[PDB]
């Protein structure tokens, strides 16, 4: 469940533009990453992860902020 | 060649505002994103990989559907 | 220091839209982008890390290329 | 606390162990093996000599005479 | 098919192999040795404890009593 | 020129050396490890096999009969 990996691994979250930001405990970013590319969620253009920083790109017309809000509400 | 990397590496290509996404399968991300480096096209400002996905950043005023659509091309 | 390691690893800086690009040398990405992130900028959103490459997201309505010029001012 | 900690992260984390001559072989879920090596790291196990995380796998070497089959039960019975 | 796709992978990603005790050493181009461990992960050998890749170099762990030559081997008889 | 070079990224970089067995264990601050371990694969060391970094630690084989330590004692050497 994302939901509860959200619990253990987001720090925060953070946006600007067409990116959320999400940062991790160290090393936790392909980790949390990759398990948000398994969801599949459609406004989720692709996901990079490097060490404790995910960027997550949103579909146009969703903005960065919001799609970040949904992953922090969950 | 790109061409011939691009064949065996890009499983699919997506775009949000200058971005173009690139799904590799799995680790291929810093392989086609280096060989994608070395060629040095001038559209592409820098490339990072993850593990399946590059994020290419497209130099405005390009969009990263624009240059995506090249890539697929090749 | 931030400006010390600049001289050090910083090969060139690129930007586009909200994003600011740093080329290192080969596998420095990572060495140079957590050190950003040590610093603390309140207009950097995140930063994520490949071999070579750094993306560095830009708290808008700061552009990429501003936040590049203040680090390559450094 | 630290102990607690490291008990869930290798209950969440750990898929398997195993092991070759001086070293123990993790493995995770994807890209889990940075997140676990780090807290491995950060735990301070004097019988580590370092670790190495790919995506989801770690490399724990062991510190000599110690094996890598030692090392990983060791961390077994953590979990 | 598994296996001629492991060849394909072998003959494009594969730059030489070289072996130390239990490791062998697998050389890629740039960028490639997750592409090329991730695929040795997913065939399954029995000898491979486990595997780690860098950015162009593959750590390969030999299950005892294999060696890291033997293993370097059995993948160069694959191409 | 690549010795004054190979000097300098040590002295940067090398936070502290360990071995175990044919392994020389290199620790780094963080992220360092890859920028290290590229530059040492770019020295041609005939002494090493190959090398893995992680994040802030790199594995270095060392090319039998030679052991971790005294690969380990070359690169101090360097410093
Ligand atoms: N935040 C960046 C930089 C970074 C790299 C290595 C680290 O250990 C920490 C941070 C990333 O995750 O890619
Ligand atoms: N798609 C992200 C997340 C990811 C990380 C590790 C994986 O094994 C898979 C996916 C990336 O490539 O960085
Ligand atoms: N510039 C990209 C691609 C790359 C990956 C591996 C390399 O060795 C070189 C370049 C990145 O740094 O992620
Ligand atoms: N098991 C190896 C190879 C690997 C690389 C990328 C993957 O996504 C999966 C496996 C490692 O963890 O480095
Ligand atoms: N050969 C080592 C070091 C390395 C790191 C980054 C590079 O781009 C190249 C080499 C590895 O693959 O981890
Ligand atoms: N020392 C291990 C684990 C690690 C991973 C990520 C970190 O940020 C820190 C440590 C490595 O370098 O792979």
Redesign the interface.
Same mark, same amino acid.
């Given at each position: 469940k994302l939901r509860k990996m959200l619990d253990?691994?987001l720090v925060s979250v @953070?946006? &600007?533009?067409?990116?959320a !930001?999400l940062?991790?405990?160290? *090393?936790? +970013?392909? #980790?949390?990453? &990759? #398990?948000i @590319?398994?969801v599949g969620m459609e406004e989720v !253009? *692709?996901?990079? +992860? *490097?060490? @404790?920083? !995910? #960027?997550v790109? +949103?579909? @146009?017309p969703m903005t960065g902020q919001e799609l970040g809000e949904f992953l922090s509400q969950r």
């Open positions: 253990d691994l @953070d946006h &600007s533009g067409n990116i !930001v940062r991790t405990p160290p *090393g936790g +970013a392909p #980790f949390l990453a &990759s #398990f @590319d398994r !253009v *692709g996901t990079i +992860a *490097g060490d @404790d920083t !995910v #960027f790109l +949103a579909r @146009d």
